[PDB]
């Protein structure tokens, strides 16, 4: 199986440290999950050999709570034991933070993944084993001035891309922030009024649920609706992805997501990946009930709209990125 297949595509990465002395790891900040885990030095899979692996014995501040763990991202389980130690995230250091030390097969493709682990930023209800998420510890340990964090994902050249704990940077967005209430506290789940193409409602006419997920590269939705969306914008099937003729970019329709009565429009320039060819920034992904079905506003959306995640008021702030 490929437990992390949904994270193997274009992502943004950051660095964190665990233990004393610090052991560095490249991780993905994922608002679509809530656990922090990194490869264990005890993972002897060929796929783990190319990554930084946590070595408990080299850290004087490490301790074992006693519980083991197992997480699921929808395509296979990842298991190991839970550890506790100091975790540092540029400027801040959380003491006693618990995280997973994965041991089981992570998947052959993980061998070339550009990241080592994942740092979930979702709600604790999504955390497996009732392990307190990093951001919840930050709040509980009064490390942040405001109970929120925000993400800026740069489309060019992603040099200036940054994650901010404790607030947001108004230099990354124009106008005032539009707030959206979190409908279900697990993922950063919100409600869509409707989705329209070419200025005409075409999906979720009666509203549907979605989540703002930094861990998801594209904008996803029920596979069937996406197909309808693919040919509506002019995308065509290929080897396994949907391509679009770069030329007809200016003749393609706008895709608008109406959230809390506000229109969030994506021009074909915004929902098309230049990764010499042009492909679709939309993809099918069926989340099983009771959690799904869901639409996922991934990086493709966040690049167009600076996002603010506020645990203090349980809401999401959106505004045009700069």
């Amino acid at each position: 199986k490929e437990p992390l297949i949904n994270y193997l595509d274009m992502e943004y990465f950051g660095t964190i440290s665990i233990g004393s002395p610090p052991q560095n790891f490249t991780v993905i900040f994922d608002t679509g999950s809530s656990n922090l885990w990194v490869p264990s030095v005890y993972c002897t899979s060929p796929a783990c050999k190319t990554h930084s692996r946590f070595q408990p014995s080299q850290s004087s501040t490490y301790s074992q709570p006693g519980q083991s763990f197992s997480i699921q991202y929808g395509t296979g389980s990842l298991s190991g034991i839970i550890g506790a130690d100091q975790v540092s995230v540029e400027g801040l250091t959380v003491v006693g933070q618990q995280f997973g030390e994965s041991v089981t097969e992570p998947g052959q493709t993980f061998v070339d993944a550009e990241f080592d682990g994942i740092l979930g930023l979702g709600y604790p209800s999504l955390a497996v084993g009732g392990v307190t998420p990093v951001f919840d510890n930050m709040m509980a340990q009064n490390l942040v001035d405001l109970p929120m964090f925000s993400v800026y994902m740069s489309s060019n050249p992603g040099a200036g891309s940054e994650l901010i704990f404790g607030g947001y940077d108004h230099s990354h967005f124009s106008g005032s922030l539009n707030w959206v209430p979190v409908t279900k506290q697990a993922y950063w789940q919100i409600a869509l009024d409707n989705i329209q193409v070419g200025g005409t409602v075409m999906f979720c006419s009666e509203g549907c649920q979605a989540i703002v997920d930094t861990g998801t590269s594209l904008i996803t939705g029920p596979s069937d609706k996406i197909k309808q969306l693919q040919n509506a914008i002019g995308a065509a099937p290929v080897d396994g992805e949907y391509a679009v003729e770069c030329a007809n970019l200016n003749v393609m329709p706008d895709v608008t997501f109406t959230i809390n009565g506000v229109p969030y429009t994506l021009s074909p320039t915004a929902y098309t990946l230049l990764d010499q060819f042009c492909s679709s920034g939309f993809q099918g992904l069926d989340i099983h009930p009771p959690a799904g079905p869901l639409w996922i506003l991934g990086d493709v959306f966040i690049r167009q709209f600076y996002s603010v995640f506020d645990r203090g008021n349980n809401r999401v702030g959106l505004a045009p990125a700069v």
Binding site: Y12, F13, G14, F29, V89, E90, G91, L92, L143, V144, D145, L146, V151, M153, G158, A159, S161, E162, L163, I164, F165, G166, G167, D169
Partner: peptide, 9 residues
């Protein structure tokens, strides 16, 4: 008020 920035690439 301080902002704790985490660069992403």
């Amino acid at each position: 008020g301080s902002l704790h920035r985490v660069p992403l690439r």
